[PDB]
C-alpha cells in the first residue's frame, strides 16, 4: 500500500545502513516503489562465492 | 616533549581497547620519518620508554605507550599476551586477588618485565535502586511508566527514526544532564497517577550503592584475566613469558 | 566536532564500510540523532511523563 | 610518589527542597447561581 | 502529546527542548588537540592492505 | 474568567456548573508536591539533626520554566501533613505575591524551597568518594604519616559534584581523591591539594 | 492472565542508565552505572512476584 | 438547532438536557488556546516591545479549514487567566464577525494573533542563512575591510 | 570576489503567535424546560 | 514491430531480442548514474538530471538514445490530518492510519 518514499525510508536505507564489510562488493543498487516493493541488488566480483 | 620526533597526535576519550567508557581513553601518534628521527632515542621504543617513564608521574592513570607487534592482527602492541584463568570456580575475587598476587610479585622483576598490567577491568560501585511496586500500585501508578519514567530520563532511550538530508537517523529523549547527574534528581522525576496525580519517583523508590564489574571476561569459556606488559629492555620475551610462568605458579 | 562527526557517518562510513578490503570500520564521532531534552519539573508543571 | 588530595572543609551547607510546586489562584470562587431561572444578561 | 476537546495543544516541545545530537556523547576525538572525529579502519581478513 | 453560560441559557440555583469564574491574582498559592518519605528526613533531619531553618516559615524560592527563578521568592504558607493517597506525597501550599500578573493559577512552576541549611557538611568530591564495602563510602584521606589509609564512611545524599557524608570524616582531613593507581592502602604518598 | 502479566511484569530486565553518563555537566566527576529491577533468582522471590 | 426533545416527551423542571439550542451568528466566538510560558513570555515581553498599539485590543486572523484564511480579521476580546492543568492553556477568546455565517461555531479552526511588535531589531533573507550545522545559523557576512567573516546567529522563525 | 550583499538593519515585524483554537456561538445558549411535564407540541 | 507499435498512443514500447550476454557488449549503449552526495533531494536531481539530458541531447553526433530508465513524478492524494481536531475529537491516530 505504500509509496516508494515510505518504503525507501523505513526499509531501504534501513538495510543500507547495515550493509557493510562484505567482500567483493562492486556496487549495490536499490529500487523502492509505490507498489510497496523493494529490490536491493549487490554486485560482486566474478568468481566471488554465490 | 616529543615534538621533534612527533608529527601528530590522534587521541580518543571514551574509546579504547580493554573496554569503553569515560574512565578509559587512548592515543594515536604519528612520528616523523625515521630519516627525520635519527638514532635510537628518536625510535619508538625509547620514545615509549621515555613517554612511559614520564607518564609515571601522571596521576590517576595507567598510561602506557607501546609499539605494535609484528603480526598486528593478534595484538594492539608488542609484548606478551598471557591469560589468568579461573578453573576452580574460585570466583571473581580470588581471580582479582590472585591476579594482583602476580602483578605484585612481577613488579619486583623490572629486570625482566616492564609495564605489566591487567588488560581487564575492576569492580566499580554500581548504584542500585529499588522499587516497591506495592507502594507504587498502592499509589496507583503502574510500574512500566516508572520503567519508562526511569530508563529514559536517567539513561535516555531510543524511539524511532527520521530522515536527515535523505538518510535515516535516531530519535532521542532524555533528561538534561543537570537533571540526571545525581541520585537527588532521581525523585525530582515524577509519575502521573492513574487518577492523574503526579507522583514523585522517590516516593516509591529506594536505592543503594553496589559493586559491579564494568566488564566481565572469560577464556575458552572460563573466567580469565589477561595480563600484559613487556620483557624489560634487553630481555627476550621467552625469558619474560617464562618468568611469568614461574610467577604463574605461586 | 559534531558537525564533522555526523557528516562522516552519513556521507562516508557505509561506503567506507562497503569499500573493498574494509572488513570493519569504527567511528570516532557519532551520527546525529534527535536529542529531546526532558525537563521533569516542567512535565509535572504540565503533569506529564516521558 | 606525590598525590593530589583535598583537605577537609564542610561546615557550610544549605539544603532545600526544589521542585515544580503546583501554583493556584489565591481565591477562585466560580460563580454558582444562588437562584434558578434563565440568564438575562 | 495530546490536546483537549477544545483543542488546547500539549506538545512534545510543550515541556522540554529538542535538538540534534550524536547518538551517544560517549566518544570524543581530538587531533593534535584540535577537536576531531575519525574512523577506526580494519582490514577485512584476507585483503592486500596496500 | 470566561462565562460558563451565555445569555438566555437557563440555570438552576447553586447548580453544578458555576456561571463565571472570579479570581484574585495579587497573591497566589503554590502547592508543592513533596515525596512522602522525603519530608520525613526533613523533620527527621531538622531534629536529626541538625538541620536548621531560618527560624521562620516559610520562604520558598522559584525558578520558572524559563530556567530562571521567578522575579522574586514567595512565602511558604504551611505543610498539610496529610499524605496524598495517589500522589503518596505531602503538598506544600506557599502563597506568593503575583502583582505582575505573571504567575497564573496552576503552572506548575518549579519551586525550589529552602531547607534545613546544614550547619556542618562533610563534602567530599565524588571523585574521591569510592564506596567500600558494598555501598560504603571509603575516603582515602592520608594522615600525617602520608601512608594512604582509606577510612570507610557513608556518603550522605549526593550533592553538587561532591558527597556530603554525615559521618566517618572530620575537618582538616586531606581527601585522597585521585591517584587511585599509585595509592594502594598504606602506601606512602605526597599530598597535592 | 492475572498471574501471567504479573509474572512478566515483575520478572524481567529493567535497564536504566548512568549517573554521570553522557552528556554530563561541566564540573562533573562522579559518573557510574545505574542498577534497577532485574530478574528474580529464587522461588521465594517469585512468590513475592506480586 | 435541532429539537433535542420531540413532542410528548416528558420534561422536568430545569432538567439536565436542553430541549434545543438557539445560537447567534453576527459575532461568533473562537477559543484561542495559548501556551502558559508564552503568555508569560509575552507579558514580560511587555518589558521589551511589545509594542501593542493602541488599541491594545489585538487583531486576529484565521486560516479556515480549507486552508484559506478567513476573509477579515477578528477582535481578540479578552485575556483569560486560566491554566488548564493538563494544558498550560492560556486560552483566549477573540470574537469574530460572521455576516455570511461561514463561521459555524464549535469547529476547530485555528488562528494567529498579531500583537504590536516594536522589537524591529533583526530580519534576514534565507539565502544568507546557513542552516547546517543546524541549531546554529551562520551567515557569510562582510568583514570591516571586505575580508569576509561569517558570524554565528540564531535563526528561528523564518519570516517568509 | 563580488557578491550580492544585503546590509542588515532593524526591521519592525508584527509577525506573532499563530496558535490553535475552537469556535463557539456567543450566543451559545440552550433551551431547558423550567416547567415539568409532557411536551404537547 | 518496433516500427509498427510506434503508431499507438500512450506506450513506451519496443520489441527486443536479448544479446549474447547482458553485460557483454561489442558496441551498444551505456549505464550511467547521477547521484546525490549532499542529500540535495530528488527534485534537485531531476532538475539536475533533466539538466544532463538536455545538455546530453545536444550531441547526437556523439550521444544517442540518452534516456532515464525510471519514472517521473505523479499527482498524489495527500491527506494532511489536523491532529488536534482528531484528538479534540478523541479519535486515535493509529486507528485512523490503520483504518486507512
From Swiss-Prot, chain A:
Disruption phenotype: Loss of susceptibility to contact-dependent growth inhibition (CDI); inhibiting cells still contact the target. Homotrimer, with large domains that extend into the periplasm, interacts with AcrA and TolC. AcrA may be required to stably link this protein and TolC. Interacts with AcrZ. Part of the AcrA-AcrB-AcrZ-TolC efflux pump. It comes from Escherichia coli (strain K12). Belongs to the resistance-nodulation-cell division (RND) (TC 2.A.6) family. Disulfide bonds: none annotated. It is found in: Cell inner membrane. This is Multidrug efflux pump subunit AcrB. AcrA-AcrB-AcrZ-TolC is a drug efflux protein complex with broad substrate specificity that uses the proton motive force to export substrates. Signal peptide: none annotated. Induction: Positively regulated by MarA, Rob and SoxS transcriptional regulators (at protein level).
From Swiss-Prot, chains D, I:
It is found in: Cell inner membrane. Belongs to the membrane fusion protein (MFP) (TC 8.A.1) family. Monomeric in solution. Homotrimeric; interacts independently with AcrB and TolC as well as AcrZ. Part of the AcrA-AcrB-TolC efflux pump. AcrA-AcrB-AcrZ-TolC is a drug efflux protein complex with broad substrate specificity that uses the proton motive force to export substrates. This subunit may act as an adapter protein that links AcrB and TolC stably together. This is Multidrug efflux pump subunit AcrA.
Amino acid at each position: 500500500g505504500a509509496d516508494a518514499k515510505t518504503v525507501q525510508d523505513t526499509v531501504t536505507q534501513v538495510i543500507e545502513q547495515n550493509m557493510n564489510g562484505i567482500d567483493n562488493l562492486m556496487y549495490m543498487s536499490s529500487n523502492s516503489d509505490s507498489t510497496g516493493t523493494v529490490q536491493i541488488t549487490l554486485t560482486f566480483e566474478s568468481g566471488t562465492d554465490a | 616533549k616529543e615534538k621533534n620526533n612527533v608529527e601528530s597526535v590522534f587521541a580518543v576519550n571514551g574509546f579504547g581497547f580493554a573496554g569503553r567508557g569515560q574512565n578509559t581513553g587512548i592515543a594515536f601518534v604519528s612520528l616523523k620519518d625515521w630519516a627525520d628521527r635519527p638514532g635510537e632515542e628518536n625510535k619508538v621504543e625509547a620514545i615509549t620508554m621515555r613517554a612511559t617513564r614520564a607518564f609515571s608521574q601522571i596521576k590517576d592513570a595507567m598510561v602506557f605507550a607501546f609499539n605494535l607487534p609484528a603480526i598486528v592482527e593478534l595484538g594492539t602492541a608488542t609484548g606478551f599476551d598471557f591469560e589468568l584463568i579461573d578453573q576452580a570456580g574460585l570466583g571473581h575475587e580470588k581471580l582479582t586477588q590472585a591476579r594482583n598476587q602476580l602483578l605484585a610479585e612481577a613488579a619486583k622483576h623490572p629486570d625482566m618485565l616492564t609495564s605489566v598490567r591487567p588488560n581487564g577491568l575492576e569492580d566499580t560501585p554500581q548504584f542500585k535502586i529499588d522499587i516497591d511496586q506495592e507502594k507504587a500500585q498502592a499509589l496507583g501508578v503502574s510500574i512500566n511508566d516508572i520503567n519508562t519514567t526511569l530508563g529514559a530520563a536517567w539513561g535516555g532511550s531510543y524511539v524511532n527514526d527520521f530522515i536527515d538530508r535523505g538518510r535515516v537517523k535516531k530519535v532521542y529523549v532524555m533528561s538534561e544532564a543537570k537533571y540526571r547527574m545525581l541520585p537527588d534528581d532521581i525523585g525530582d522525576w515524577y509519575v502521573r497517577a492513574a487518577d492523574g496525580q503526579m507522583v514523585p519517583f522517590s516516593a516509591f523508590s529506594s536505592s543503594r550503592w553496589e559493586y559491579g564489574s564494568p566488564r566481565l571476561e572469560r577464556y575458552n569459556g572460563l573466567p580469565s584475566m589477561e595480563i600484559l606488559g613487556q620483557a624489560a629492555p634487553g630481555k627476550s620475551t621467552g625469558e619474560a613469558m617464562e618468568l611469568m610462568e614461574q610467577l604463574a605458579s605461586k | 566536532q559534531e558537525d564533522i562527526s555526523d557528516y562522516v557517518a552519513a556521507n562516508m562510513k557505509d561506503a567506507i564500510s562497503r569499500t573493498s578490503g574494509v572488513g570493519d570500520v569504527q567511528l570516532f564521532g557519532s551520527q546525529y540523532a534527535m536529542r529531546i531534552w526532558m525537563n521533569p519539573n516542567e512535565l509535572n508543571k504540565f503533569q506529564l511523563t516521558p | 610518589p606525590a598525590v593530589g588530595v583535598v583537605t577537609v572543609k564542610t561546615e557550610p551547607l544549605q539544603i532545600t527542597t526544589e521542585l515544580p510546586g503546583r501554583t493556584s489562584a489565591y481565591r477562585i470562587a466560580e460563580v454558582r447561581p444562588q437562584v434558578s431561572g434563565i440568564i438575562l444578561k | 502529546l495530546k490536546v483537549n476537546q477544545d483543542g488546547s495543544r500539549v506538545l512534545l516541545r510543550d515541556v522540554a527542548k529538542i535538538e540534534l545530537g550524536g547518538e551517544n556523547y560517549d566518544i570524543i576525538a581530538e587531533f593534535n588537540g584540535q577537536p576531531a572525529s575519525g574512523l577506526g579502519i580494519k582490514l577485512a581478513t584476507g585483503a592486500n592492505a596496500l | 474568567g470566561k462565562s460558563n453560560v451565555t445569555e438566555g441559557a437557563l440555570v438552576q440555583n447553586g447548580q453544578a456548573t458555576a456561571l463565571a469564574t472570579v479570581q484574585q491574582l495579587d497573591p497566589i498559592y503554590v502547592d508543592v508536591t513533596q515525596s512522602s518519605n522525603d519530608m520525613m528526613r526533613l523533620k527527621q533531619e531538622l531534629a536529626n539533626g541538625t538541620l536548621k531553618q531560618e527560624n521562620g516559615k516559610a520562604k520558598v524560592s522559584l525558578i520558572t520554566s524559563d530556567g530562571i527563578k521567578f522575579p522574586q521568592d514567595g512565602t511558604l504558607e504551611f505543610s498539610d501533613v496529610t499524605v496524598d493517597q495517589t500522589t503518596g506525597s505531602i503538598t506544600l501550599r506557599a502563597i506568593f505575591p503575583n502583582p505582575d500578573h505573571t504567575m497564573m493559577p496552576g503552572m506548575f512552576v518549579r519551586a525550589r524551597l529552602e531547607e534545613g541549611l546544614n550547619p556542618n557538611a562533610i563534602l567530599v568530591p565524588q571523585q574521591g568518594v569510592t564506596r567500600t564495602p558494598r555501598g560504603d563510602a571509603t575516603v582515602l584521606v592520608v594522615g600525617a604519616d602520608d601512608k594512604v589509609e582509606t577510612r570507610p564512611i557513608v556518603a550522605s545524599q549526593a550533592i553538587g559534584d561532591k558527597w556530603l557524608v554525615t559521618e566517618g570524616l572530620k575537618a582538616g582531613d586531606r581527601v585522597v581523591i585521585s591517584g587511585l593507581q599509585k595509592v594502594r592502602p598504606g602506601v606512602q604518598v605526597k599530598a597535592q591539594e | 492472565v492475572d498471574v501471567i502479566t504479573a509474572i512478566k511484569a515483575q520478572n524481567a530486565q529493567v535497564a536504566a542508565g548512568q549517573l554521570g553518563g553522557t552528556p554530563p555537566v561541566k564540573g562533573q566527576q562522579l559518573n557510574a552505572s545505574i542498577i534497577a529491577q532485574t530478574r528474580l533468582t529464587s522461588t521465594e522471590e517469585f512468590g513475592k512476584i506480586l
